Amino acid sequence: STEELFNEYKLTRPYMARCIRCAVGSCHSPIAIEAVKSDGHDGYVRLQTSSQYGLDSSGNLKGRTMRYDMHGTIKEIPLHQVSLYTSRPCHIVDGHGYFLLARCPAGDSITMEFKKDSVRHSCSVPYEVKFNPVGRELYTHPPEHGVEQACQVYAHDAQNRGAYVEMHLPGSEVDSSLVSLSGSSVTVTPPDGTSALVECECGGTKISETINKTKQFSQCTKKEQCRAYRLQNDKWVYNSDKLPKAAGATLKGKLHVPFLLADGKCTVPLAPEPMITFGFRSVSLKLHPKNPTYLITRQLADEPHYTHELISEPAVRN
Amino acid sequence: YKTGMDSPAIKCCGSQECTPTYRPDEQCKVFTGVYPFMWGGAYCFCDTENTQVSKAYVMKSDDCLADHAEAYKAHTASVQAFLNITVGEHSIVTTVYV
Amino acid sequence: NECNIPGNFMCSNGRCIPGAWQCDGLPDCFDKSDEKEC
Amino acid sequence: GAFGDIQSRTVSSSDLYANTNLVLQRPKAGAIHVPYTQAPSGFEQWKKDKAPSLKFTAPFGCEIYTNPIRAENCAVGSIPLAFDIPDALFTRVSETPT
């Protein structure tokens, strides 16, 4: 029953947003990044991007795809062309809607990039990504063998749960490949099956909504004075701050978010066994930690005198 | 938390206003002297007297259900034991309250 | 059986692939156990 | 910036108190975004500090558990007992060895 899950991001389209670090400078990117969440334990993060996943360029379902917005025309590539990295390369697991799930190492940035023919697209964001160990032994890469603590990692399926984001009317995405000059006037050519609207300032205050017609206007000489917007009544976007909004109550629905933080099981390491030397009312502890290990002691009386210590070197505690 | 942000309301050669919603910690401010850009060129034709409204509010995170901390108050406890009593080779195992 | 991570489907060999990869028209588990009963 | 900057009354209360020091900032000249500046998650900062649990620090060697909040096996105090024994259980002398 995956088609019942995917059917709500069919109402939506990918968009372009402002990314601060692109391949050269500051650009408008089709793969812009809204938020990175890293609160699952063993290295799984969940990116909310400005692209869409698990859908094809039409609206139907293709398996491992990124769907993006390239200056209005929606394009697509396979998922194995898209790579992202924090410090080391991350590994993309799955995608659903505006959301992506990756297995990432710890780092102070996220950079997603894909490669078209001779254009390289990138988007680096200053979003901190952390790695959260489980248990009282602080590893950096999850181990090979040990025991199994309970944990909380981002679930890998796109099951509808009780958490939502809010969708809206896309506003007037302005264009300038529409407006062009005649030999003596200004010419607006809206695309087929799409209505534009034109605001100019060459007479007094001029404004028009045009449909499907190469519609010239007299008294406008230079095309710097006319802005040709674009309109799409269908096809929701996210409530982004990198997009402008429409006029009047703005709201069209809400969608569920995939890959929520669920309870699970995680494998944790097991420290080398301490070597215990006994004496008269005293206990010595030889400790050889492989990776840093909390020692926590307490006494079973009315004053516990608890001791809490991160130990990362070979140490003897009496 | 999760700082939610509404899209910027932009009017060309106009002036917006602040309409509140009484969302939690809902800040709103109106900025004048703005010449915004889209991907397909500039957004207004006016140099000045344009207006952009920022609106932000705090809502709680999507993972609030499985990752939250419960603040309680406790007083006047109640002790309860699982005894195993044998009186004259007749044994029971009963939760006694003490 | 059941995987340790909740969103995962368990293949024939015990390999846990994501649950949206079951019955997708693409073979991921050994002997296509993601493509047996669709 | 500390524990409880979000205060939702229950998990599904749909009315949360929030004091997160949110301040809106002026957008960069030529860009459509909503720039803010607020204090970080006090819940995360509580999780970074977190003096250890009562499972490891409790006096008398208690064993704190979760689903009912309870302690176990705290070796403190003493239980008195009252036995109201019927007279039928008292066997006579010569029906036992001596």
Added chain:
Amino acid sequence: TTMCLLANVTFPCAQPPICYDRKPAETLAMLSVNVDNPGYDELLEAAVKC
């Protein structure tokens, strides 16, 4: 039970009159006015499929 709205026609939320594969923007407008609804997920998964 829960009754959803497109007009003054309180239809059952499991039985919508329109679907997205028929109409591009009327379904989105029907979802627009019915956001404050406890049976919005029922209206949602019914309003996709015919």
